[PDB]
Design an enzyme around this catalytic site. Structure first.
Site, PDB file in Angstrom:
ATOM      1  N   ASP A   1      -4.597   0.560  -3.189  1.00  0.00           N
ATOM      2  CA  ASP A   1      -4.649   1.518  -1.962  1.00  0.00           C
ATOM      3  C   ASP A   1      -3.491   2.591  -2.345  1.00  0.00           C
ATOM      4  OD1 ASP A   1      -6.576   0.156  -0.824  1.00  0.00           O
ATOM      5  OD2 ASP A   1      -5.514  -0.161   1.078  1.00  0.00           O
TER       6      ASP A   1
ATOM      7  N   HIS B   1      -3.017  -5.929   2.303  1.00  0.00           N
ATOM      8  CA  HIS B   1      -4.259  -5.219   3.027  1.00  0.00           C
ATOM      9  C   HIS B   1      -4.076  -4.642   4.267  1.00  0.00           C
ATOM     10  CE1 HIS B   1      -7.865  -3.777   3.457  1.00  0.00           C
ATOM     11  NE2 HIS B   1      -8.725  -4.876   3.829  1.00  0.00           N
TER      12      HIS B   1
ATOM     13  N   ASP C   1       1.008  -1.097   0.013  1.00  0.00           N
ATOM     14  CA  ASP C   1      -0.009   0.077  -0.190  1.00  0.00           C
ATOM     15  C   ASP C   1       0.937   1.453   0.024  1.00  0.00           C
ATOM     16  OD1 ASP C   1      -2.029  -1.804   0.270  1.00  0.00           O
ATOM     17  OD2 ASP C   1      -2.766  -1.301   2.037  1.00  0.00           O
TER      18      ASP C   1
ATOM     19  N   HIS D   1      -1.206   4.427  -0.196  1.00  0.00           N
ATOM     20  CA  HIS D   1      -2.309   5.466   0.476  1.00  0.00           C
ATOM     21  C   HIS D   1      -2.040   6.811   0.250  1.00  0.00           C
ATOM     22  CE1 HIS D   1      -5.101   2.860   2.213  1.00  0.00           C
ATOM     23  NE2 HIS D   1      -4.375   1.998   2.765  1.00  0.00           N
TER      24      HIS D   1
ATOM     25  N   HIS E   1      -4.196  -7.574  -3.661  1.00  0.00           N
ATOM     26  CA  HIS E   1      -4.562  -6.801  -2.335  1.00  0.00           C
ATOM     27  C   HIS E   1      -4.931  -7.522  -1.172  1.00  0.00           C
ATOM     28  CE1 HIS E   1      -5.068  -2.927  -0.257  1.00  0.00           C
ATOM     29  NE2 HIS E   1      -6.232  -3.270   0.019  1.00  0.00           N
TER      30      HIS E   1
ATOM     31  N   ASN F   1      -8.983  -2.224  -2.212  1.00  0.00           N
ATOM     32  CA  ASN F   1     -10.304  -2.178  -1.419  1.00  0.00           C
ATOM     33  C   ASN F   1     -10.765  -0.574  -1.278  1.00  0.00           C
ATOM     34  OD1 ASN F   1      -8.106  -2.196   0.983  1.00  0.00           O
ATOM     35  ND2 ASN F   1     -10.073  -1.415   1.701  1.00  0.00           N
ATOM     36  N   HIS F   2      -9.692   0.523  -1.614  1.00  0.00           N
ATOM     37  CA  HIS F   2     -10.092   1.483  -1.444  1.00  0.00           C
ATOM     38  C   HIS F   2     -10.385   2.214  -2.782  1.00  0.00           C
ATOM     39  CE1 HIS F   2      -9.061   3.003   2.619  1.00  0.00           C
ATOM     40  NE2 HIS F   2      -8.678   2.069   2.974  1.00  0.00           N
TER      41      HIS F   2
HETATM   42 MN    MN Z   1      -6.272  -2.222   2.112  1.00  0.00          MN
HETATM   43 MN    MN Z   2      -4.637  -0.308   3.218  1.00  0.00          MN
END
Ligand code: MN
Ligand code: MN
Lengths: 195, 211, 290
Positions: free
Chosen positions: C80, C236, C52, C54, C162, C112-113
């Site tokens: 992400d 994740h 990730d 982010h 992910h 998932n984002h």
């Molecule tokens: Mn995630």
């Molecule tokens: Mn994450």
């Protein structure tokens, strides 16, 4: 500058060497940046017998920033400590790195060829690098091939012309028809640059 | 014990041949002459044959000057069509030099038996270099794996450097004290077993030998 | 017709967002590139797997300085690229531009984002709104997220996704047969595929999150044996050490964001698969800031 190389070398040099093995790569590159500075104020023999292998140690480092910093420092040392010295000390390790299985070490080799070839002299550059660079063109990894094309494009004008044509042009022609898109683009760019 | 028992007198015939043939004053055979004989454009096995056959008679003390030329040119002995007697006499001379001049002979011999495609191939394999990593001697030109004299040489080297590395890392851990002994024993066992495994894989018939 | 794209990449490396028209053209090109990618994207063995990000853009530049600059280094980001960060837009734009320019040298998998609802709640929508004065750029990016491949497959051995596994998914052919071009549902195959985690557990279990499942060691063992996979790379979950093996070296969680909301203080790491899958994890700390 204010204390002099002698007192620092007697005093802080083992500590500097110990710091060069630190876990944090930022510390290591902080140590790396002063090798041209130490080189300028110190003789070739002592650096060769103390820090040259240490300089080579950075080339195989995990972090890419360390490797490129060491590559730039190698450029500085070769333009500072002469040419035949690099052939006696630096070039064998680079050639040894060319045989590495891991591709990132070969990319460090290609970057080293890029920086060295500008200030390594025409005859030395061709008769050492060109057999080494040309063999690397058949590597299965496409990254290696397009980096070879980029390296030939960069070190193109600095070498002899007959060797330029006869060696570089066929392999770049080979790379232009290579299946991978990036290899195609970089080989075409190199051919246009050479003209 | 092999080197020591090599020094043991067998029958004294060697002393007789020393006093008889060497008195000819054919001692004009010099390391430079041997080096020139090695570096002929054709193989010219006759001259090197005569020189090294003569060197068998030389006592160990005066045979030290010939260490450089014999070791440096032993890579050329790997080429196809070298007579067996050349390799046998080189093995004998190497054993003599090992009996009197062991450590530096080992260093230069390992430096000489590099694959040679890498040319220099990091010729900085000093005494300490092999003493820390005995398996370097196994990183040698493939042709020695089917050259029984130089293979015997390499085996002597490997045994010596295994024992040397044991003593070396024992001394190193002692001086760096300023548990770790268990790691020492484990490293030594692993190193010996790895050497054994590499030798066993050397014993395997390759695909070409399978063919 | 590519010099502008290199100029955009150079501009983005200095953390300067593109204009709305530029983002529209970039999303168009990326859509025309991602449609030709299967849900299980095959990836050649030399690649640096990264978890990730982010939107922690300076940390992404730290990651690039660690593993090298693309296209010289192959990369694989397991979702992400948005939310929980003050520079989500710059991060996602740089990643998409790299994908367009060097599609063979970088693979970006859906996270998932990468969903309209999650972006609306967790502040990627707000960041787009502030940085562009409207929702058009957010719409363009969230449309692109539907096209991101669900998973990857490095050399037929390493399975990069992910999230975790799903009770209804036990074959790579099932993942290949999914219709990824849609919003992440509240259940079903791809929702679990993007939201599930491993656990020191036996069998399945309802996830502490609002979606997905928790799978034990036996689940990953059976999946790996059935599909001929040696490892299931995953990204994740947070990892203080940067990376963490799970389930007797069957699953490794890779987190490539040093800190998570600039407060967790966690380390980061990236796996580096070489030419013979001799893996190596390169951990790093957050880059210095002003
Ligand atoms: Mn995630
Ligand atoms: Mn994450």
């Amino acid at each position: 500058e204010v204390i002099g190389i002698r007192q620092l070398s007697q005093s802080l040099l083992p500590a500097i060497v110990e710091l060069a093995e630190d876990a944090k790569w930022r510390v290591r590159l902080a140590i790396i940046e002063y090798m041209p500075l130490l080189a300028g104020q110190l003789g070739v023999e002592f650096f060769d017998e103390k820090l040259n292998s240490l300089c080579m140690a950075w080339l195989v480092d995990h972090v890419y920033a360390i490797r490129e910093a060491a590559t730039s420092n190698l450029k500085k040392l070769v333009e500072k400590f002469g040419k035949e010295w690099a052939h006696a000390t630096i070039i064998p390790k680079v050639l040894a790195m060319s045989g590495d299985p891991n591709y990132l070490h070969r990319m460090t080799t290609l970057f080293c060829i890029n920086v060295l070839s500008e200030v390594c002299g025409q005859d030395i550059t061709t008769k050492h690098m060109l057999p080494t660079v040309l063999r690397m063109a058949g590597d299965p990894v496409a990254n290696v091939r397009f980096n070879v094309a980029k390296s030939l494009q960069k070190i193109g004008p600095i070498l002899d012309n007959s060797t330029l044509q006869s060696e570089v042009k066929p392999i770049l022609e080979k790379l232009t028809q290579d299946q991978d898109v990036d290899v195609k683009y970089f080989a075409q760019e190199a051919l246009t640059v050479l003209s | 014990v092999d080197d020591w028992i090599c020094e043991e007198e067998i029958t004294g015939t060697d002393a007789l041949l020393r006093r008889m043939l060497l008195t000819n004053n054919a001692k004009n055979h010099s390391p430079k002459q041997l080096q020139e004989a090695f570096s002929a454009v054709p193989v010219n096995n006759t001259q090197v044959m005569q020189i090294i056959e003569h060197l068998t008679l030389l006592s160990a003390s005066e045979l030290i000057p010939y260490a450089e030329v014999l070791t440096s040119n032993m890579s050329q002995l790997l080429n196809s069509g070298v007579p067996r007697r050349i390799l046998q006499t080189v093995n004998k001379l190497w054993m003599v030099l090992n009996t009197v001049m062991p450590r530096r002979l080992w260093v230069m011999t390992v430096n000489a038996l590099q694959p040679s495609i890498k040319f220099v191939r990091q010729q900085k394999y000093t005494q300490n270099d092999l003493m820390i990593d005995p398996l370097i001697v196994l990183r040698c030109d493939q042709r020695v794996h089917r050259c029984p004299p130089l293979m015997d040489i390499t085996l002597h080297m490997l045994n010596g450097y295994l024992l040397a590395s044991k003593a070396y890392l024992s001394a190193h851990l002692k001086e760096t004290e300023q548990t770790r002994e268990e790691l020492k024993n484990a490293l030594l066992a692993a190193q010996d077993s790895a050497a054994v495994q590499i030798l066993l894989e050397i014993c395997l018939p390759t695909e070409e030998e399978k063919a | 017709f590519t010099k502008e794209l290199d100029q955009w990449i150079e501009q983005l490396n200095e953390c300067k967002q593109l204009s709305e028209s530029q983002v529209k053209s970039l999303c168009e090109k990326a859509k025309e590139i991602l449609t030709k990618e299967s849900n299980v994207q095959e990836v050649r063995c030399p690649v640096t797997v990264c978890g990730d990000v982010h939107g922690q853009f300076h940390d992404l530049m730290e990651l690039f300085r660690i593993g090298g600059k693309s296209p010289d280094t192959n990369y694989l980001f397991m979702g992400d690229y948005v939310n929980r960060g003050y520079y989500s837009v710059e991060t996602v734009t740089l990643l998409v531009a790299l994908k367009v320019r060097y599609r063979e040298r970088i693979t970006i998998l859906r996270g998932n984002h990468e969903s309209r609802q999650i972006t609306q709640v967790y502040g990627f929508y707000d960041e787009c709104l502030r940085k562009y004065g409207n929702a058009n750029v957010w719409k363009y990016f969230t449309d692109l997220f539907d096209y991101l491949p669900l998973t990857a497959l490095v050399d037929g051995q390493i399975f990069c996704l992910h999230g975790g596994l799903s009770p209804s998914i036990d074959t790579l052919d099932h993942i290949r047969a999914l219709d990824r071009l849609q919003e992440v549902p509240h259940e079903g195959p791809m929702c679990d595929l993007l939201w599930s985690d491993p656990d020191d557990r036996g069998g399945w279990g309802i996830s502490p999150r609002g979606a997905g499942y928790t799978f034990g060691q036996d689940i990953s063992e059976t999946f790996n044996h059935a599909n001929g996979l040696t490892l299931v790379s995953r990204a994740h979950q947070l990892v203080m050490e940067g990376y963490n093996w799970c389930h007797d070296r069957n699953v490794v969680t890779i987190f490539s964001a040093p800190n998570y909301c600039y407060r967790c203080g966690n380390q980061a790491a990236i796996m580096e698969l070489d030419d013979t899958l001799k893996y190596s994890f390169l951990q790093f700390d957050p880059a210095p800031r002003r």
